[PDB]
Every structure is written in C-alpha cells, then in structure tokens.
Amino acid sequence: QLTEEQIAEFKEAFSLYDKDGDGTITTKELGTVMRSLGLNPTEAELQDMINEVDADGNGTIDFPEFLTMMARIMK
Ligand SMILES: [Ca+2]
Ligand SMILES: [Ca+2]
Structure with a gap:
C-alpha cells in the first residue's frame, strides 16, 4: 500500500526539481539539476x-510524470 512517508519523499524530490514552487518542471529547472550532477x-x-x-x-x-521518471530509475 501507499504510505504518507513515501508520498513525503516523492514530494521532496519533486520540490528539489521544482525550485520556484509553481507545480511544473521547466527546461531551466531540469538544466540546473543536470549541471549540478556534472553534465x-x-x-x-x-x-x-x-x-x-x-x-x-x-x-x-x-x-x-515525475513519478514515472522515478519508477524507471529505481526499477
Ligand atoms: Ca516550476
Ligand atoms: Ca506534461
């Protein structure tokens, strides 16, 4: 079953991408994160x-959609 802790972690990751907090991830935000990884x-x-x-x-x-991304990385 789904738990509130799992939900909480997902929300943390999304927010690490969604910097301005408007609920959608842009090319610029993606860019920020990918550059911090070394790309x-x-x-x-x-x-x-x-x-x-x-x-x-x-x-x-x-x-x-982000949830799909995580699904592919972990699985
Ligand atoms: Ca955003
Ligand atoms: Ca979309």
Missing part, C-alpha cells in the same frame, strides 16, 4: 528529455 546539456537535449515522459503533451513535467 552540460543544451536546451534542446533538455527538451528531448521532457518529451520522453510528457504524457499530456503540454511540454513540461508535472507530478505524475
């Missing part, structure tokens, strides 16, 4: 990364 992606490469998990086609990552 140097172009704007278009960041957009290709969004395009992989963008299930509603709106061009940015929301919470359930």
